[PDB]
């Protein structure tokens, strides 16, 4: 559910 932050300006919901 939460937002995953994988890099500068790069994120996604699982």
């Amino acid at each position: 559910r939460k937002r995953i932050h994988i890099g500068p300006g790069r994120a996604f919901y699982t």
Partner: antibody
Amino acid sequence: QVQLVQSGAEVKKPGASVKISCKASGYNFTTYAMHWVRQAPGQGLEWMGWINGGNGDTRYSQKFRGRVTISRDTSASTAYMELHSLTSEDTALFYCARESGDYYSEISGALDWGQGTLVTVSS
Amino acid sequence: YELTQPPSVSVSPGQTARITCSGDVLPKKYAYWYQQKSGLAPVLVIYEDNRRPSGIPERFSGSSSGTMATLTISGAQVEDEGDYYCSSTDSSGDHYVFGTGTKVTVLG
């Protein structure tokens, strides 16, 4: 097997700059971001910033924004951290670490870590 | 942004040790846990609140609810002594921080 090899120990005089390197192999360098972490002797971990190995965008923690430049060279598969205008109080161990997170990764977090680079600052 | 941790937790061998991590935006962001033993790089032990990487023993588990995440070491052993740090992003998501850190002591 993911491998991150950092450059060796440094000593600098106050006001100098130092550029530490972190050579990555065993994975696609442009797919993942690279974290940089500082640990002063006997203290906790401090996150400094990170960079996308692909598009090169960076973000920096409040403490180090304006004092450091993180960069990457995809053709050398290496990430870099430059620390400008060192003072003696900057003496610390520095780590790079690969972010394992990705749209197509089942994991996230700093799974793989370099061995650390000691930087000593003194006159 | 601070992730607040207790400076010290003690546990008797075979008992369950719990290390908490409090932060204002943990309701929206994932927590990660790192173990650092004497003279070594940190090791990722729990990710995305409650998932365990391969090769990490099953006695490590995590959970998170509201503004507190918790790392649980069931049946703690001497080899589990070390410094434990949680990690998460601030509200923007552009920056991570490590928590204030917890030293785990195994009694007896």
